[PDB]
Amino acid sequence: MTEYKLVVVGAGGVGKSALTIQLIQNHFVDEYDPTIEDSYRKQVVIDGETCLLDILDTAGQEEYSAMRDQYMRTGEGFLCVFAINNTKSFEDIHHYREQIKRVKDSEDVPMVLVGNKSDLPSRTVDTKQAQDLARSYGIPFIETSAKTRQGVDDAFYTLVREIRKHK
Ligand SMILES: Nc1nc2c(ncn2[C@@H]2O[C@H](COP(=O)(O)OP(=O)(O)O)[C@@H](O)[C@H]2O)c(=O)[nH]1
Ligand SMILES: *S(=O)(=O)c1cccc(S(=O)(=O)Nc2cccnn2)c1
Ligand SMILES: [Mg+2]
C-alpha cells in the first residue's frame, strides 16, 4: 500500500487539530492543546486502493524549528486551513503557502485550501473570496467542518489524489 505524507498548516485556532482528529479518529474534539504538534496515522481506502496517511498537525511555536523543517521537506502535500468566521486566518494563508513554496523550492506542490468551521453562521470570508485565492494559487478550495464532518474526507482525499497524480 502507498504511503502519503500530509501537512496541515494555518493560523492557531482554525481547526487543524479538530480536522486531523476527525479524519483519523472520527471524533470532534473541542479542547485540544494548541501547543501540541503531532503526527497521525490512518489506513484508508481512496479510489479502491488502500493508502497509508501520515499527517502532521502543526503548532505555532514550531513553525521555524529544524524538526518542522524536516517534516516540511519530506511532506508531500499541504492543507492550508483558515476558518470562515475569522478573517485574519484567511489573510494569513499567503504566509503559510509562501513557507511551503520556500521549503519545497518548487512551484509544483500538492496543496488544498481549506475553509473550516463551515457549520458556523457568523461567516466573515466569502466562498468566492476563497475560490479566487485558490484559483490564483492553482489549487482547489474545499469547505470543511470538523464538527459535522462536512468535506473532511474530501479535503484530505483531494490532497492525496493531487500527490498521486504528482508522482
Ligand atoms: N464550530 C466548529 N468549531 C471548530 C471546527 N474546527 C475546530 N473548531 C474549534 O475551534 C477551536 C480550535 O480548534 P483547533 O483544532 O485547536 O485549531 P488548531 O489550533 O488549528 O488546531 C476549538 O475549540 C475547536 O472546537 C469546526 O469545523 N467547527
Ligand atoms: S516524525 O516523528 O519524524 C514522524 C512521525 C510519523 C511519520 C513520519 S513520516 O511519515 O516519515 N514523515 C511525514 C512528513 C510530513 C507529514 N507526515 N509525515 C514522521
Ligand atoms: Mg492544534
Residues in the ligand 1 pocket, defined by CB under 6 Å: 10, 12-18, 30, 32, 34, 116-117, 119-120, 145-147
Question: Could you give phi then psi for residue 156, rounded to 5 degrees?
Answer: -70, -40
* Resolution of this deposited model, Å: 1.7
| Residues around ligand 3, an ion, CB closer than 5 A | 16-17
Going by C-alpha positions, the residue among 43, 44, 45, 53 that lies closest to residue 77 is: 53
Spatial separation of the C-alpha atoms in residues 54 and 27, rounded to whole Å: 18
Residue boundaries of the structural domains of the chain = 2-166
Going by C-alpha positions, the residue among 166, 155, 162, 157 that lies closest to residue 81 is: 155
Residue listed under C-alpha cell 499567503: 94
* CATH annotation of 2-166: 3.40.50.300
Going by C-alpha positions, the residue among 38, 21, 39 that lies closest to residue 30 is: 21
Nearest ligand by distance to the CA of 114: 1
Spatial separation of the C-alpha atoms in residues 139 and 133, rounded to whole Å: 9
Going by C-alpha positions, the residue among 32, 55, 59, 28 that lies closest to residue 42 is: 55
